[PDB]
Structure 1
Amino acid sequence: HHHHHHGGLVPRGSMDDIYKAAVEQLTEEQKNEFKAAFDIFVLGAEDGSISTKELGKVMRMLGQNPTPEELQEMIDEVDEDGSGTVDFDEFLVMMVRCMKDDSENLYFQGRRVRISADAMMQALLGARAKESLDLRAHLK
């Protein structure tokens, strides 16, 4: 409907709503997975936060070779304040938005959109592994 744009010039004292929404959409197990993904994205971070190189890195793996300008525009476009860099807070809400955004935009008969979120997630996980639970005994 109207929602809320301005921060009310009153930082902190809330933010609980954002966390609550994430919890409702993301489960405890899912939340842990999210953190794991964040750590991977944080790896190689020039400024400690996702950048053109980080985003470009995954693009190369997908077989895509986007220009530096394209990556910069994408970050600025998705950026909350257009700072040009996505921080932990911005990254967290960004992921949540993409989740509900995709759900909202479905209607019927989808179209080949670059890559699917599920496909990317599966690629990150690669081969299934549960040897973590069993260390002394190896069963595969």
Structure 2
Amino acid sequence: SLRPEEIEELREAFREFDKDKDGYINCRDLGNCMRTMGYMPTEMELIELSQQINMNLGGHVDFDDFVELMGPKL
């Protein structure tokens, strides 16, 4: 039932990808994070998804959504 240990790592990543350090990000470097250690989405997966988030969501992702989307492992 690991979570806080795995999440703690995401916190560092979120900031690492956060260049504006404004406490927010988008489907820009987000996809680059999934391939870093996530699940490495396919070709259209990293696109269809990134966009889906860009459109559906609104065009922004918070450390919460990033963590939630990242999930534990699967």
TM-score scaled by length of structure 2 = 0.49
Higher helix share: 2
Which is greater in Rg?
1
TM-score scaled by length of structure 1 = 0.31
| Higher RCO (CA 8 Å, separation ≥ 6 residues) | 2
